[PDB]
């Protein structure tokens, strides 16, 4: 409620309660992470149908 | 002509850099209008694939053979938007006719 | 058949009214119970965005086709929205009324609602809100509804700033599919044949389900808010709950509103008959405007006073107006003034029905509310049947009821609700 | 304990507004930045009302009605 | 049952003349209400710069008491019968009109005759209304469109009695007296220059009997053979700029000399104005509007709004466009407006001409929907044309207009013509007058 650590100054600086003693937020559900970039194994999903597309009529 | 179209698809060379046909078609005004009509995820995927294409062509390299896009899984994402924009342009043209 | 108004109800719930007056211009209006009343907190501004989305691409005609065809015919397409309901009105020549009805039903029944179209349209939504809020009575009435009701009438008629940039085409589709149903629609037409109206009704409007969503009953809360924005004048509306549409109490409230002064009848007049104006002008020498604000709905009403005054004289203006209404509630009124108020109300109703816009709006509102047409002779008959004791009872109800105050301006001398 | 800083524990920096005329030797945390907030649209100025005759009729007396059109300007009726 | 038989089935007007020459016109409708008004052929064109605000003072003083109904008795009576009352005055006309019920016809005609004949002008009321008029002029100064239209009239008809505004100057408003107002009443409110117009649920026989009862004694004769006389006004190609950079938007009006009331080119010019069209920010049409000026305005996001006007007086007119925009688009909108004007002058198209004809048809019938606009049209038509032009005649003229005579009339009235320009606000980017002229002729035609 008084002090919270600072990344750049590397010192215990002043802060409010809401970021000192509850640095975790009040979000209901932990959302998923991002996609795995530069992955060795790739599994592409089939979108709709290839025979349904590619039609120039 | 499934095999012949696959052979021409491989010989074109844009599957080697991980593009798509709708990725690599040239941007006219209708094409830019349909790109503006593309949704967020498809637009981001398109721009990343183009950026990787620029990077590979700069390095004079291509993707690995397993990472090449295949003829069976080449989605045509920009095509319905392009047809709708073409339809709108033709309708404006015939109203200018009348 | 100009002798009478043809009226019928389809089995699905639709209402078809048609008058063949052989007018040079024919008008077609679809009245939908899909206003801002039928939104919860998750999709605010959806009715506003739909109202500006009434000229978009549809399944059957593009937006370009709709606007080019309407302006090539020369007729006009308009949307008139109140909190209870919207009205899509198209006006044109008798010859092109078939194409006009095709465009109208295509844009009101099967809209495509593309996301790029609404993404381009939200800027127009912001601009339209700013233009509507250019005058302060709009903001005062919006705030007054917001503090008078808890749900379904505290919903603003204009889109909130946070909801701008957030309304989606899926939300628009959900709103249209849930509230644009056949039991909530009424198709009226002036200068069109009943057979043609029934044919287009069974062609287009038969595919809708039923009653749709119910509503939220619009529970009253009362209270007050005061927005200080430093205008030259101070606006203050003090209202209380009143009767709903279709009551002798509501008729008495309208008679009381025209007794206290619903507006001026003379350009640059002094409002001699207006009791509120006379009472305020008795103790002032500054510009002002006091009137009686009346607003009835499906299940609730709001009757009160509206005062525009100076920053310094706001307290005495509001106190004089409230004391005048209190005197009316106590019974300081004569039968001659009640008769004059009844004459004012009858004349105002007749001048409303006088034009084609007002006649079409009146028959559409009657078709939605009552489900049957009510003649102006019967309306004037019940207005005459309003008694002065009912006026006293309505004024007593306003005085004793809980109050809703919406104020704006320079609010240093404007009294609060407990100070009144 | 005759001060709001010692009276309200977590609500002291909410009840107290602090701004420095000159920068301190020690940087603070949570510096904050305005993320380029948008501008309201420019509009034509509306006439004021300097007399009772011009102010007459401006008081609302009916439910608020919005009206838009394809080629008709929007109207707000009180 | 189509448009032609509908327009023929619109009921005709009925015009009668009293013994003193006062015109009495009426149109009977099926409504239970009526609009009864008195139109006087008077205004700033008739005012001679000494009494430049006399008509404005008289329409302020008309409802503040008479000889038979002093003070607020007239207002009390008209509000007791519930009739709405209104008055206005343009540079050629003065209208006192009342919306009432059909059953109150003798009361409304007695009130109208007492207003236009036996008005009492007490000095205290004159001073109070002088202060009122000064404050209302300050309010109109705060309004911006009216300033630009007054500037356009002044710079277009400078040196003539049509340049002066309806309200007149502040010094004249302060210095007018009761004697000048009575002289204006006894000079301009003559019997044969007034039309008593009734519209709606009115019987013409009853209206004529009531006019014979009340408006019989008007005393049309002049006091010392002081007969006034209309003179033509000289249109001057000119420009006026009122630079005040603190204003948020800029209003610019560009006009040329019009044909006048009696000229038959008014229909063609109104059709051309329908081709040009109008636009506001609240328009739902967007880019795909039929008007190309509106379409390019939405596409390039130039203007806030624009409208086209055709104001007509006796053999005189101002015909052009008024647009309000920001300071960075005045040059663009002047260029586009002049391009559209000369596109109409050079290359008309049958399809757009038909679109504009349909627009003007619908505008005319939709405006004449309503007893109060019917009465307004009756009074204005009997004052200007001397007769009420029927909707069938208007439709016949519309059908007569096609693309060739549209091109001819546009080239006659727009092409190579000196305009009147009135700018107000941040008008630094407003082009020079030589540039406006150079845009008002093409080098490819």
Interior angle at CA C314, CA C265 and CA E129, nearest 5? 45
On chain B, the residues whose CB falls within 8 A of the CB of C116 are 36-37
On chain C, the residues whose CB falls within 8 A of the CB of D72 are 76, 78
On chain A, the residues whose CB falls within 8 A of the CB of D28 are 13-14
With beta carbons less than 8 A apart as the criterion, state whether C420 and C322 touch. yes
Write the CB contacts of C33 (distance below 8 Å, at least 6 apart in sequence).
C84, C85, C179, C184, C185, C368
Which structure tokens are listed for C258?
């025209």
Judge: D71–C71 Cβ closer than 8 Å, yes or no: yes
Please state, in angstroms and as integers, the Cα–Cα distance from residue A32 to each residue in A36, A43, B43, B45, following that order: 12, 19, 22, 19
Distance from C21 to chain D by nearest Cα, in Å?
Answer: 25
Judge: B91–C62 Cβ closer than 8 Å, yes or no: yes
Judge: C23–E358 Cβ closer than 8 Å, yes or no: no
Judge: E142–D48 Cβ closer than 8 Å, yes or no: yes
CA-wise closest residue to C196 among C99, C107, C106, C110? C99
Dist CA D55 CA C317 (whole Å): 14
Dist CA C133 CA C158 (whole Å): 9
With beta carbons less than 8 A apart as the criterion, state whether C341 and C259 touch. yes
D70: enclosing H helix or E strand: none
Extract the runs of DSSP E, i.e. beta strands, from C199-271. 223-228, 234-242
Nearest chain B residue to A44, by CA: B73
Helix (H, G, I), strand (E, B) or coil at D78: coil
With beta carbons less than 8 A apart as the criterion, state whether C212 and C117 touch. no
Judge: B76–A54 Cβ closer than 8 Å, yes or no: yes
Dist CA C409 CA C398 (whole Å): 25
Please state, in angstroms and as integers, the Cα–Cα distance from residue A52 to each residue in A55, B25, B39, C76, E199, following that order: 7, 20, 21, 42, 67
Distance from C355 to chain E by nearest Cα, in Å?
Answer: 5
Q: Estimate the share of chain D in helix, then strand, then coil, as percent rounded to the nearest 5.
A: 15, 10, 75
Judge: E358–C72 Cβ closer than 8 Å, yes or no: yes
- Nearest-CB residue to D53 (from E132, E277, E304): E132
Nearest chain E residue to D66, by CA: E282
Dist CA E135 CA D54 (whole Å): 9
What pairs with residue E37 in β-bridges?
A: E97, E197
Q: Is C244 on the interface with D (CB under 8 A)?
A: no
Judge: D53–E136 Cβ closer than 8 Å, yes or no: yes
Tell me how far apart the 2 most distant CA atoms of chain A are, in Å: 70
- Count of C-E CB contacts under 8 Å: 144
Beta strands at A12-14 and C185-190: parallel, antiparallel or unpaired: unpaired
Judge: D51–E139 Cβ closer than 8 Å, yes or no: yes
Judge: C115–B39 Cβ closer than 8 Å, yes or no: yes
Judge: A16–D27 Cβ closer than 8 Å, yes or no: no
Which structure tokens are listed for C420?
């009144």
Cα four-point dihedral sign E34, E38, E39, E43: negative
Beta strands at C76-81 and C86-93: parallel, antiparallel or unpaired: antiparallel
Distance from E332 to chain D by nearest Cα, in Å?
Answer: 19
Dist CA E420 CA E271 (whole Å): 21
- Nearest-CB residue to E101 (from C67, C124, C347): C347
Helix (H, G, I), strand (E, B) or coil at A37: coil
Dist CA C340 CA C333 (whole Å): 12
Please state, in angstroms and as integers, the Cα–Cα distance from residue B80 to each residue in B31, B86, B94, C324, E224, following that order: 11, 10, 21, 68, 85
On chain D, the residues whose CB falls within 8 A of the CB of A18 are 10
CA-wise closest residue to C354 among E199, A7, D25, E306? E199
Beta strands at E316-325 and E303-313: parallel, antiparallel or unpaired: antiparallel
Dist CA C317 CA C290 (whole Å): 8
Residue E43's Cβ-count burial label (10 Å; 0-12, 13-18, 19+) is buried
> Please, do chains A and D touch (3+ CB pairs < 8 Å)?
yes
Residue C279's Cβ-count burial label (10 Å; 0-12, 13-18, 19+) is buried
Residue C374's Cβ-count burial label (10 Å; 0-12, 13-18, 19+) is middle
Question: Best of D43, D66, D76, D77 to disrupt the C interface by mutation (most C CBs within 10 Å)?
Answer: D66
CA-wise closest residue to E427 among E238, E239, E250? E250
Judge: A44–B79 Cβ closer than 8 Å, yes or no: no
CA-wise closest residue to E321 among B22, E335, C43, D77? E335
Write the CB contacts of B4 (distance below 8 Å, at least 6 apart in sequence).
none
Which structure tokens are listed for A26?
């009040």
E7: enclosing H helix or E strand: helix E3-9
Distance from D74 to chain C by nearest Cα, in Å?
Answer: 8
- Nearest-CB residue to D70 (from C55, C82, C307): C55
Write the CB contacts of D58 (distance below 8 Å, at least 6 apart in sequence).
C137, C289, C308, D49
On chain A, the residues whose CB falls within 8 A of the CB of B75 are 47-48, 53
What pairs with residue C25 in β-bridges?
A: C93
Q: How many CB atoms lie within 10 A of CB D76?
A: 18
Helix (H, G, I), strand (E, B) or coil at C77: strand
> Please, do chains C and A touch (3+ CB pairs < 8 Å)?
no
Distance from B95 to chain A by nearest Cα, in Å?
Answer: 23
Distance from D22 to chain E by nearest Cα, in Å?
Answer: 34
Phi, psi angle pair for B42, to nearest 5°: -65, -40
| H helix count then E strand count, chain C | 14, 11
The residues of E that are catalytic are: 59
Judge: A54–B75 Cβ closer than 8 Å, yes or no: no
Phi, psi angle pair for A46, to nearest 5°: -75, 120
On chain E, the residues whose CB falls within 8 A of the CB of C376 are 32
DSSP string computed for E388-410: ---HHHHHHHHHH--HHHHHHHH
> Please, do chains B and D touch (3+ CB pairs < 8 Å)?
no
Judge: B74–A50 Cβ closer than 8 Å, yes or no: yes
- Count of A-D CB contacts under 8 Å: 19
- Nearest-CB residue to A15 (from D26, D27, D29): D29
With beta carbons less than 8 A apart as the criterion, state whether E178 and E121 touch. yes
Nearest chain B residue to A57, by CA: B83
Show which subunits contact A, needing at least 3 CB pairs below 8 angstroms: B, D
Q: Is C55 on the interface with D (CB under 8 A)?
A: yes
CB < 8 Å from E in window 282-341 of C: 340
Nearest chain D residue to E286, by CA: D70
Angle in degrees, 0-180, between the axes of helices E105-117 and E204-214, rounded to the nearest 10:
40
Q: Is C389 on the interface with E (CB under 8 A)?
A: no
> Looking at residue E323, what DSSP letter applies?
E
Dist CA C300 CA C151 (whole Å): 12
On chain A, the residues whose CB falls within 8 A of the CB of D15 are none
Dist CA B94 CA A30 (whole Å): 54
- Count of C-D CB contacts under 8 Å: 129
Residue C99's Cβ-count burial label (10 Å; 0-12, 13-18, 19+) is middle
Beta strands at E238-243 and E93-101: parallel, antiparallel or unpaired: unpaired
Solving technique for this entry?
cryo-EM
CA-wise closest residue to C309 among C274, C270, C281? C281
CB under 8 A, 24+ apart: contacts of E412-415:
E412/E265, E413/E256, E413/E257, E413/E258, E413/E259, E413/E265, E413/E269, E413/E319, E414/E256, E414/E341, E414/E342, E414/E344, E414/E345, E414/E440, E415/E342, E415/E345, E415/E440, E415/E441, E415/E445
Phi, psi angle pair for E91, to nearest 5°: -60, -10
Judge: C72–E100 Cβ closer than 8 Å, yes or no: no
Dist CA E318 CA E312 (whole Å): 7
Dist CA E237 CA E65 (whole Å): 44
Judge: E7–C24 Cβ closer than 8 Å, yes or no: yes
């Amino acid at each position: 409620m008084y002090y919270k650590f600072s990344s750049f100054t590397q010192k215990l600086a002043g802060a409010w309660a809401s970021e000192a003693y509850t640095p975790q937020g009040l979000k209901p559900v932990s959302x998923x992470x991002x996609x795995x970039x530069x992955x060795x194994x790739x599994x592409x999903x089939x979108x709709x149908x290839x025979x349904x597309x590619s039609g120039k009529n | 002509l499934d095999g012949f179209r696959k052979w021409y698809y491989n010989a074109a060379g844009f599957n080697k850099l991980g593009l798509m046909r709708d990725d690599t078609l040239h941007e006219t005004e209708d094409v830019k209008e349909a790109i503006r009509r593309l949704p967020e995820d498809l637009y981001n995927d398109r721009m990343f694939r183009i950026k990787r294409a620029l990077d590979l062509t700069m390095r004079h390299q291509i993707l690995p053979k397993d990472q090449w896009t295949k003829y069976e899984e080449d989605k045509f994402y920009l095509e319905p938007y392009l047809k709708e924009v073409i339809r709108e342009r033709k309708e404006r043209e015939e109203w200018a006719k009348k | 058949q100009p002798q009478d108004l043809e009226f019928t109800k389809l089995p699905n719930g639709l209402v078809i009214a048609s008058l063949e007056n052989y007018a040079p211009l024919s008008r077609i209006g679809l009245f939908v119970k899909a206003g801002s009343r039928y939104e919860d907190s998750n999709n605010l501004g959806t009715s506003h965005l739909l109202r500006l989305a009434s000229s978009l691409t549809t399944k059957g005609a593009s937006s370009f086709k709709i606007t080019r065809g309407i302006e090539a015919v020369g007729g006009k397409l308009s949307v008139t929205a109140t909190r209870e309901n919207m009205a899509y009105t198209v006006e044109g020549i008798r010859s092109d009324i078939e194409i006009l009805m095709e465009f109208l039903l295509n844009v009101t029944t099967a809209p495509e609602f593309r996301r790029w179209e609404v993404a381009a349209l939200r800027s127009q939504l912001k601009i339209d809100k700013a233009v509507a809020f250019q005058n302060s009575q709009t903001r005062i009435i919006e705030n007054l509804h917001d503090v008078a009701y808890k749900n379904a009438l505290a919903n603003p008629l204009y889109c909130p700033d946070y909801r701008m940039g957030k309304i989606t085409s899926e939300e628009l589709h959900y709103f249209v599919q849930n509230h644009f149903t056949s039991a909530r629609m009424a198709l009226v037409g002036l200068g069109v044949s009943h057979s043609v109206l029934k044919q287009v009704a069974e062609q287009f409007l038969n595919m809708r389900g039923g009653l749709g969503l119910a509503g939220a009953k619009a529970k009253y809360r009362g209270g007050e808010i005061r927005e200080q924005n430093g205008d030259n004048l101070v606006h203050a509306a003090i209202v209380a709950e009143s009767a709903a549409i279709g009551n002798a109490e509501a008729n008495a409230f309208s008679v009381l509103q025209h007794l206290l002064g619903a507006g001026p009848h003379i350009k640059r007049g002094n409002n001699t008959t207006s009791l509120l104006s006379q009472s305020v002008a008795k103790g002032s020498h500054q510009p002002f405007d006091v009137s009686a604000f009346n607003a009835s709905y499906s299940d609730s009403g709001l009757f009160g006073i509206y005062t525009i005054s100076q920053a310094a004289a706001a307290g005495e203006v509001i106190n004089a107006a409230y004391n005048q209404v209190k005197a009316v509630a106590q019974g300081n009124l004569s039968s001659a003034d009640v008769q004059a108020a009844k004459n004012k109300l009858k004349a105002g109703y007749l001048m409303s029905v006088e034009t084609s816009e007002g006649f079409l709006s009146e028959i559409g509102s009657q078709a939605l509310a009552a489900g049957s047409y009510m003649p102006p002779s019967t309306v004037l008959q019940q207005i005459d049947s309003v008694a002065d004791a009912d006026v006293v009872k309505a004024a007593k109800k306003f005085v004793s009821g809980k109050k809703s105050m919406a104020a704006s301006g320079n609010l240093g001398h404007t009294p609060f609700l407990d100070e009144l | 304990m005759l001060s709001v800083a010692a009276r309200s524990g977590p609500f002291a920096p909410v009840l107290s507004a602090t701004s420095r005329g000159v920068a301190g030797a020690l940087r603070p945390l949570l510096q904050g930045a305005v993320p380029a907030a948008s501008e309201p649209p420019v509009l034509d100025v509306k006439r004021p009302f300097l007399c009772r005759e011009s102010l007459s009729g401006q008081a609302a007396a009916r439910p608020l009605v919005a009206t838009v059109g394809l080629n008709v300007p929007a109207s707000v009726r009180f | 049952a189509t448009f032609a038989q509908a327009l023929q089935s619109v009921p005709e007007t009925q015009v009668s003349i009293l013994d003193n020459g006062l015109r009495v016109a009426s149109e009977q409708s099926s409504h239970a209400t009526c609009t009864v008004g008195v139109w006087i052929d008077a205004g700033s064109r008739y005012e001679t710069e000494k009494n430049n605000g006399a008509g404005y003072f008289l329409e302020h003083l008309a409802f503040k008491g008479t000889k038979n109904r002093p003070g607020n008795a007239l207002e009390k009576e008209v509000e007791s019968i519930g009739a709405h009352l209104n008055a206005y005055s343009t540079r050629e006309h003065t209208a006192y009109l009342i919306k009432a019920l059909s059953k109150d016809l003798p009361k409304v005609v007695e009130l109208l005759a007492d207003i236009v004949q036996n008005s009492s002008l007490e000095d205290s009321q004159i001073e109070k209304e002088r202060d009122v008029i000064l404050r209302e002029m300050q309010e109109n100064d705060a309004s911006m469109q009216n300033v630009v239209f007054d500037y356009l009239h002044a710079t277009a008809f400078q040196g003539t009695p049509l340049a002066q505004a309806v309200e007149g100057p502040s010094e004249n408003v302060r210095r007018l007296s009761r004697t000048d107002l009575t002289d204006y009443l006894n000079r301009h409110y003559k019997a044969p220059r007034m039309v008593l117009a009734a519209a709606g649920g009115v019987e013409h026989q009853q209206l004529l009997d009531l006019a014979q009862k009340h408006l019989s004694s008007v005393s049309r004769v002049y006091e010392e053979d002081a007969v006034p006389g209309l003179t033509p006004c000289r249109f001057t190609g000119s420009e006026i700029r009122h630079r005040d950079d603190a204003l948020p938007l800029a209003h610019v009006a560009i006009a040329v000399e019009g044909p006048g009331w009696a000229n038959p080119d008014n229909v063609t010019l109104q059709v051309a104005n329908a081709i040009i069209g109008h636009y506001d920010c609240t328009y739902g049409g967007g880019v795909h509007l039929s008007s190309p000026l509106a379409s390019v305005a939405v596409a390039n996001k130039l203007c806030q709004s624009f409208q086209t006007f055709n104001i007509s007086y006796s053999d005189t007119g101002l015909l052009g466009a008024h647009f309000v925009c920001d300071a960075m688009s005045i040059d663009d909108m002047v260029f586009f407006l002049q391009g559209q004007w000369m596109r109409l002058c050079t290359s008309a198209t049958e399809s757009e001409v038909t679109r504009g004809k349909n627009i003007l048809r619908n505008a005319l019938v939709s405006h004449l929907d309503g007893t109060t606009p019917v009465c307004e049209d009756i009074g204005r038509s009997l004052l200007t044309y001397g007769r009420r032009i029927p909707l069938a005649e208007w439709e016949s003229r519309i059908q007569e207009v096609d693309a060739q005579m549209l091109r001819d009339i546009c080239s006659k009235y727009f092409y190579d013509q000196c305009p009147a320009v009135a700018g107000y606000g941040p008008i630094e980017q407003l082009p020079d007058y030589n540039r406006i002229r150079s845009g008002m002729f093409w080098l490819r035609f």
